[PDB]
């Protein structure tokens, strides 16, 4: 079936992941080693801030999570998943975690800063991506899932806001807050409504097939400019998702429609990526006939566009948020819950 070079690559990738997975790094910097520059984005339990390391001058994106808000939102296991996975993975299209640490109030994950901004911004600015442009990004996600799934990891948060565009025009995936190592099935209701597979919505035990469904949603959104299932109320979105009905814009190629019908298959036992040939059904589909998979992996293909930015500390591709304190309490909070962080 697969070439021995590919099998050996993935076998070594798993060996290296498991060594770090079984002995995670902890406490590799502290807050006063950095200067704060700007808030790059916010969220329910945390935010991401551009920082500069005071000794080296290097820029980083620091994700800050409030321990008490994490406990209240029942995200303890998820935050521990995120840091433990990020410190163990290594792949060209994943954001690199450089440091992690905690204090009395917060958990900190310090990643290399990617100045080009989120794919979401670029997609909304241009309207929609041409099929070659969408296919260049989709190929990178296919390889990333091939890697992650071979490590028994499910990603569970694919969407344009989590795909950063780097200085070469390639993707780096960020936010592993829903990622998890899974042996067979898992059961948590999590994700963004527009991207949820039917089996998540229906409260079933599910597997890596949910990532391949989300790839179908992403490719549709890149090529159309909007996602296939949307509405004002989540329950209305869920009803569309489970119905098995998708309408395609007339400008979609026949090959694109065919691939999407096989990724957006409501029956998970019939969905591309989850059949006997696994990822190969996707890589060998006609829509990818022009893709040089090794060249993509090696970053040898010229990108469709390079983001405009002035230097490693430029924030122009991210937007403006109210600047709030990073307060650290005099007393430790939730120490027992986060001992492993
Ligand atoms: Cl997901 C993924 C699966 C397999 C490979 C792979 N198989 N052989 C290689 C060689 C050629 C380039 N340098 C190592 O890479 C890469 C990514
Ligand atoms: Cl409610 C709950 C459900 C599952 C787990 C769990 N699954 N694997 C683990 C590892 C890492 C931390 N300790 C052992 O914990 C913890 C709490
Ligand atoms: Cl390297 C890097 C640079 C920026 C970010 C980032 N900025 N905002 C976010 C959140 C909120 C919206 N989407 C996820 O993440 C993460 C990593």
Swiss-Prot record:
EC class name:
transferase
Q: Which GO terms describe its biological process?
A: adenylate cyclase-activating G protein-coupled receptor signaling pathway; adenylate cyclase-inhibiting G protein-coupled receptor signaling pathway; cellular response to cold; cellular response to glucagon stimulus; cellular response to glucose stimulus; cellular response to heat; cellular response to parathyroid hormone stimulus; intracellular potassium ion homeostasis
Which residues carry the post-translational modification Phosphothreonine, per the record?
39, 186, 188
- Positions of modified residues (Phosphoserine): 1, 130, 329
Q: What is this protein called?
A: cAMP-dependent protein kinase catalytic subunit alpha
The protein's gene is named PRKACA
Native organism = Cricetulus griseus (Chinese hamster)
Which residues does the record list as Phosphotyrosine (modified residue)? 321
Residue limits of the AGC-kinase C-terminal domain?
Answer: 289-341
Signal peptide (UniProt feature, chain positions): none
Give a Pfam family name: Pkinase
């Amino acid at each position: 079936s697969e070439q021995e070079s590919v099998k050996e690559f993935l076998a070594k990738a798993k060996e290296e992941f498991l060594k770090k997975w079984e002995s995670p790094s902890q406490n590799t910097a502290q807050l006063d080693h950095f200067d704060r520059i700007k808030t790059l984005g916010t969220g329910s339990f945390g935010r991401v801030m551009l920082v500069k390391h005071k000794e080296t001058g290097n820029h980083y994106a620091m994700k800050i999570l409030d321990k008490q808000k994490v406990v209240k939102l029942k995200q303890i296991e998820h935050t521990l998943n995120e840091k433990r996975i990020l410190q163990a993975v290594n792949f060209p299209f994943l954001v690199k975690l450089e440091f992690s640490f905690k204090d009395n109030s917060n958990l900190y994950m310090v990643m290399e800063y990617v100045p080009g901004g989120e794919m979401f911004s670029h997609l909304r600015r241009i309207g929609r991506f041409s099929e070659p442009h969408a296919r260049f990004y989709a190929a990178q996600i296919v390889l990333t899932f091939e890697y992650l799934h071979s490590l028994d990891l499910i990603y569970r948060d694919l969407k344009p806001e989590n795909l950063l565009i780097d200085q070469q025009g390639y993707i780096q995936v960020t936010d592993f807050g829903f990622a998890k190592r899974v042996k067979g099935r898992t059961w948590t209701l999590c994700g963004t409504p527009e991207y949820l597979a039917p089996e998540i919505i229906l409260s079933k035990g599910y597997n890596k097939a949910v990532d391949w469904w989300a790839l179908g949603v992403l490719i549709y959104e890149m090529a159309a400019g909007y996602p296939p299932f949307f509405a004002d109320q989540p329950i209305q979105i869920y009803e569309k998702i489970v119905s098995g009905k998708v309408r395609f814009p007339s400008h979609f190629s026949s090959d694109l429609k065919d691939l999407l019908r096989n990724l957006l298959q409501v029956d998970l036992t019939k969905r591309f990526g989850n059949l006997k040939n696994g990822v190969n059904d996707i890589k060998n589909h006609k829509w990818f006939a022009t893709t040089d998979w090794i060249a993509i992996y090696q970053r040898k293909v010229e990108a469709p566009f390079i983001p405009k930015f002035k230097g490693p500390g430029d924030t122009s591709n991210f937007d403006d948020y109210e600047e709030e304190e990073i307060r650290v309490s005099i007393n430790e909070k939730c120490g027992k819950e986060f001992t492993e962080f």
